[PDB]
Amino acid sequence: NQIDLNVTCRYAGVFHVEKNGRYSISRTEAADLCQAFNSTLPTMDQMKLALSKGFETCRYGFIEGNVVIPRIHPNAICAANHTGVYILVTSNTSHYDTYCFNASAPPEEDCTSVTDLPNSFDGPVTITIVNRDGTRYSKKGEYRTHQEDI
Numbered sequence: 001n002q003i004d005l006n007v008t009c010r011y012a013g014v015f016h017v018e019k020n021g022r023y024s025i026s027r028t029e030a031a032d033l034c035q036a037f038n039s040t041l042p043t044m045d046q047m048k049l050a051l052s053k054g055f056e057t058c059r060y061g062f063i064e065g066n067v068v069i070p071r072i073h074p075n076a077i078c079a080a081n082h083t084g085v086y087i088l089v090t091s092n093t094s095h096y097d098t099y100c101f102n103a104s105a106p107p108e109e110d111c112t113s114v115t116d117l118p119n120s121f122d123g124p125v126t127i128t129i130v131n132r133d134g135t136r137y138s139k140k141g142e143y144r145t146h147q148e149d150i
């Protein structure tokens, strides 16, 4: 009973979380997952500031109100070569990665590793935070509050 959460650097408190190496997070699960990191879904303004500090990914993820990809450099296979906060317009499907915003993180680029999941609750799952440099932090718990997400 295990969940892997791959996380990035934070940029003005915003970071990306990919669950189990595939698009697998619902909008309700995303809010609960950010809450376990003492974080919230970013606002579009928070995401635009993160972008300006150096944040980009090549994966769709929830923010408040939309599903987006922050892009700095044009790449043909990432958001159809767009730059800026690219907003997903048309999709049949509902499951993506998520972004999260931690207000207590540093104001600019923070590429230190994530070493805690401070607000998860009691439960049976082994949750492992996997950093880009491979360092890992694991704890037994749960973060999903909606049974349909379990």
Ligand SMILES: C[C@@H](N)C(=O)N1CCCC[C@@H]1C
Pocket (backbone or CB within 6 Å): 010, 037, 038, 102, 105, 112, 113, 114, 115, 116, 117, 118
């Ligand atoms: C200690 C710090 N690197 C950390 O582990 N966190 C803050 C950044 C967002 C997620 C997590 C709560």
